[PDB]
């Protein structure tokens, strides 16, 4: 799109790796540094996807 | 079970920015894009509103661009839609729908609708 | 104007009738488009979401086909329920604009 197309989604940071082949779905807010952000503001908890 | 809910129908006025607000319930508000469609007697879907609450970037339709705004809250888990300059043609059923098909493995089609309400601006 | 229309506005047919009918469109794509059933003033049901697929819910009375500027709706046998319109909505790019369809009726 021009301006637009904000639906093609992808992963551009977290922190863990996954074996080879391995499967997962998770889409969880990372954690901020210090205790996870479960549904809430933190330091950043940015955004898996 | 994942659903959407918008605030009871009321009356909406042109000529000033009005402040709309619908919550999403299963899961984090974040994990969806949210679409707004105004689907009317005649026409059926809609694209004059799409936001990623997280990454915060949200694109409209020609028809409404530039007027208008959109606003996650995740303190009240709300998702709000900044409204002017409207005109007759509104009449529509309203509803804020998951368009969150991208971890689906499906291009983007909407999964998830609001109970969606009757807005009532005409006459 | 990337729009599509229908060509009998008032489509009539029994119950169990072979219609091979189209909907055309100014441009021809290969990806991003659907059709859709609807009634009048409530939401449209996901019946085709991309191009020779059906997905679950659909009967198999309905089905769809095509390519290029038109694309072909197959109806093996149209149900007494289906007072009702279609719809061949497009996808592709940013400003988009609906459909207009089709009216259909049970002829008797």
């Known amino acids: 799109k021009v301006g637009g197309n904000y639906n093609y989604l992808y992963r551009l940071f977290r922190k863990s790796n996954l074996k080879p082949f391995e499967r997962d779905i998770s889409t969880e807010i990372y954690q901020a540094g210090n205790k996870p952000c479960n549904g809430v503001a933190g330091f950043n908890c940015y955004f898996p996807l | 079970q994942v659903q959407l809910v918008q605030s009871g129908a009321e009356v909406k006025k042109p000529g000033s920015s009005v402040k709309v607000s619908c919550k999403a319930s299963?899961?984090?508000?974040?994990?969806?894009?949210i679409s707004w469609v105004r689907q009317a007697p005649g026409q059926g879907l809609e694209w004059m509103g799409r936001?990623?609450?997280?990454?915060?970037?949200?694109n409209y339709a020609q028809k409404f661009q530039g007027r208008v705004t959109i606003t996650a809250d995740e303190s009240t888990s709300t998702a709000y839609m900044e409204l002017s300059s409207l005109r007759s043609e509104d009449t529509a059923v309203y509803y804020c729908?998951?368009?969150?098909?991208?971890?689906?493995?499906?291009?983007?089609?909407?999964?998830?609708w609001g109970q969606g309400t009757m807005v009532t601006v005409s006459s | 104007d990337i729009q599509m229309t229908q060509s009998p506005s008032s489509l009539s047919a029994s119950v169990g009738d072979r219609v091979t009918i189209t909907c055309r469109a100014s441009?021809?794509?290969?990806?991003?488009l659907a059709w859709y059933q609807q009634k009048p003033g409530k939401a449209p049901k996901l019946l085709i979401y991309?191009?020779?697929n059906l997905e679950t819910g659909v009967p198999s009375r309905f089905s769809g086909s095509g390519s290029g500027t038109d694309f072909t709706f197959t109806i093996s046998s149209l149900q007494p329920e289906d007072i009702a319109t279609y719809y061949c909505?497009?996808?592709?790019?940013?400003?988009?604009?609906f459909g207009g369809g089709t009216k259909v009726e049970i002829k008797r």
């Open positions: 729908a998951s368009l969150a098909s991208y971890s689906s493995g499906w291009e983007d089609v909407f999964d998830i």
């Open positions: 299963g899961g984090t508000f974040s994990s969806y894009a």
């Open positions: 936001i990623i609450p997280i990454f915060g970037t949200a």
């Open positions: 441009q021809g794509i290969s990806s991003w």
């Open positions: 991309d191009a020779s």
């Open positions: 909505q497009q996808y592709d790019n940013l400003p988009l604009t």
